[PDB]
Design an enzyme around this catalytic site. Structure first.
Site, PDB file in Angstrom:
ATOM      1  N   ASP A   1       0.945  -0.872  -0.136  1.00 38.13           N
ATOM      2  CA  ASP A   1       0.041   0.158  -0.278  1.00 38.13           C
ATOM      3  C   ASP A   1       1.114   0.907  -0.386  1.00 38.13           C
ATOM      4  O   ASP A   1       1.056   2.155   0.887  1.00 38.13           O
ATOM      5  CB  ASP A   1      -0.788  -0.447   1.380  1.00 38.13           C
ATOM      6  CG  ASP A   1      -2.182   1.202   1.113  1.00 38.13           C
ATOM      7  OD1 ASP A   1      -2.443   1.917   0.126  1.00 38.13           O
ATOM      8  OD2 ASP A   1      -3.600   0.985   2.362  1.00 38.13           O
TER       9      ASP A   1
HETATM   10  N1  LIG Z   1     -10.698   0.522   0.878  1.00 38.48           N
HETATM   11  C1  LIG Z   1      -9.549   0.518   2.259  1.00 38.48           C
HETATM   12  C2  LIG Z   1      -8.588   1.174   1.680  1.00 38.48           C
HETATM   13  O1  LIG Z   1      -9.061   2.956   0.746  1.00 38.48           O
HETATM   14  C3  LIG Z   1      -7.217   3.436  -0.048  1.00 38.48           C
HETATM   15  O2  LIG Z   1      -7.275   2.591  -1.268  1.00 38.48           O
HETATM   16  C4  LIG Z   1      -8.256   2.985  -2.267  1.00 38.48           C
HETATM   17  C5  LIG Z   1      -7.640   4.217  -2.871  1.00 38.48           C
HETATM   18  O3  LIG Z   1      -8.134   5.370  -2.506  1.00 38.48           O
HETATM   19  C6  LIG Z   1      -8.923   3.971  -4.688  1.00 38.48           C
HETATM   20  O4  LIG Z   1      -7.779   5.135  -5.720  1.00 38.48           O
HETATM   21  C7  LIG Z   1      -9.080   6.427  -5.597  1.00 38.48           C
HETATM   22  O5  LIG Z   1      -7.895   7.275  -3.822  1.00 38.48           O
HETATM   23  C8  LIG Z   1      -6.531   7.712  -4.447  1.00 38.48           C
HETATM   24  C9  LIG Z   1      -5.649   8.784  -3.584  1.00 38.48           C
HETATM   25  O6  LIG Z   1      -5.402   7.760  -2.325  1.00 38.48           O
HETATM   26  C10 LIG Z   1      -6.658   8.272  -6.018  1.00 38.48           C
HETATM   27  O7  LIG Z   1      -5.604   8.413  -5.886  1.00 38.48           O
HETATM   28  C11 LIG Z   1      -6.941   7.354  -7.102  1.00 38.48           C
HETATM   29  N2  LIG Z   1      -7.888   8.396  -8.149  1.00 38.48           N
HETATM   30  C12 LIG Z   1      -9.034   7.101  -6.788  1.00 38.48           C
HETATM   31  O8  LIG Z   1      -9.774   6.545  -7.650  1.00 38.48           O
HETATM   32  C13 LIG Z   1      -9.115   2.803  -5.144  1.00 38.48           C
HETATM   33  N3  LIG Z   1      -9.345   3.294  -6.397  1.00 38.48           N
HETATM   34  C14 LIG Z   1      -8.998   2.241  -4.272  1.00 38.48           C
HETATM   35  C15 LIG Z   1      -8.026   1.510  -3.065  1.00 38.48           C
HETATM   36  N4  LIG Z   1      -8.535   0.102  -2.226  1.00 38.48           N
HETATM   37  C16 LIG Z   1      -6.666   3.382   1.242  1.00 38.48           C
HETATM   38  O9  LIG Z   1      -5.466   4.418   0.283  1.00 38.48           O
HETATM   39  C17 LIG Z   1      -6.440   2.370   1.252  1.00 38.48           C
HETATM   40  O10 LIG Z   1      -5.338   2.632   2.909  1.00 38.48           O
HETATM   41  C18 LIG Z   1      -7.185   1.412   2.418  1.00 38.48           C
HETATM   42  O11 LIG Z   1      -6.978   0.176   2.783  1.00 38.48           O
END
Ligand SMILES: NC[C@H]1O[C@H](O[C@H]2[C@H](O)[C@@H](O[C@H]3O[C@H](CO)[C@@H](O)[C@H](N)[C@H]3O)[C@H](N)C[C@@H]2N)[C@H](O)[C@@H](O)[C@@H]1O
Ligand SMILES: O=C1c2ccccc2-c2n[nH]c3cccc1c23
Length: 253
Positions: free
Chosen positions: A180
């Protein structure tokens, strides 16, 4: 005994995590900031997974120190020291002109982690392992189709699952990965990148596991910054198939 918590002020932090209760411990005279992660039920396993990875990875990288860890059949409690400073995201937002220095620091740091010889790593975090977790999360309905990337928003979970499978097979690559490697997980202090947090997914996988997550985070700032990540890291032509696969796999977590 957890009694090494007296004198502290308590706050509950919602950092958009999955499952675990995070408490911030502050306001204690001449004592450092601490974090306490609590996992109930299946989340006790996720907190247990982080603890072993922090314990192992600390011999190699700058991470929060394990002060105390407790495991009972349904509960896991993880007490650690805080890494002083701000997230890479918060730094990037406050100082847009520092973008290039931040991205360079992130690439240099990611190279350091990727350089740890695999012969030292007791954890498996590979595609096959992660695809199984992705499948259990899809089949339990735990995947949130709301937090998908723009190119996949409105898509049902199964569309991402079927389309992601068309990107396989792909070239074998194995390095020690974060799991992550997002802008919220890298900590900056006085211009320098001082450490990383959220190590629950650490293990051997393809380097695009970390490259894809960071590259995507940088997408919300500039395409030139996303381009510089691969340039500083040292990849001539980023593997877009591998990049897309890892971005699609992260949708299920
Ligand atoms: N579900 C829990 C998780 O949530 C986030 O992860 C998610 C991202 O946030 C999403 O992406 C979005 O947010 C990003 C910024 O972080 C942007 O750049 C991007 N354009 C956006 O589409 C992505 N598609 C799914 C991913 N699982 C956290 O990071 C993580 O710690 C935590 O476990
Ligand atoms: O959630 C944590 C966190 C969780 C466990 C251990 C250290 C940290 C930590 N160190 N610095 C920061 C900045 C923002 C969030 C967090 C940190």
């Amino acid at each position: 005994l957890d009694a090494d918590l007296y004198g502290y002020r308590w706050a509950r932090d919602n950092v958009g995590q999955s499952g675990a209760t995070i408490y911030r411990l502050y306001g204690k005279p001449n004592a450092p900031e601490l974090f306490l992660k609590h996992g109930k039920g299946s989340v006790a396993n996720d907190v247990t997974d982080e603890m072993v990875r922090l314990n192992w990875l600390t011999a190699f990288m700058p991470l929060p120190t394990i002060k105390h860890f407790i495991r009972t059949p349904d509960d896991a409690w993880l007490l650690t020291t805080a890494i002083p400073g701000k997230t890479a995201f918060q730094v990037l937002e406050e100082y847009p002109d520092s973008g290039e220095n931040i991205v360079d620091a992130l690439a240099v740091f990611l190279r350091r982690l990727h350089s740890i010889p695999v012969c030292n790593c007791p954890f498996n975090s590979d595609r096959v392992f992660r695809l199984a977790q992705a499948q259990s999360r899809m089949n339990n309905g735990l995947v949130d189709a709301s937090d998908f990337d723009d190119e996949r928003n409105g898509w049902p979970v199964e569309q991402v699952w079927k389309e992601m499978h068309k990107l396989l097979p792909f070239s074998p690559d194995s390095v020690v990965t974060h799991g992550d490697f997002s802008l919220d997980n890298l900590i900056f202090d006085e211009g320098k990148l001082i450490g990383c947090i959220d190590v629950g997914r650490v293990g051997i996988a393809d380097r695009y596991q970390d490259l894809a997550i960071l590259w995507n985070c940088l997408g919300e700032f500039s395409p030139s910054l996303q381009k510089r990540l691969f340039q500083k890291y040292g990849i001539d032509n980023p593997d877009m198939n591998k990049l897309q696969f890892h971005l699609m796999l992260d949708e299920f977590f």
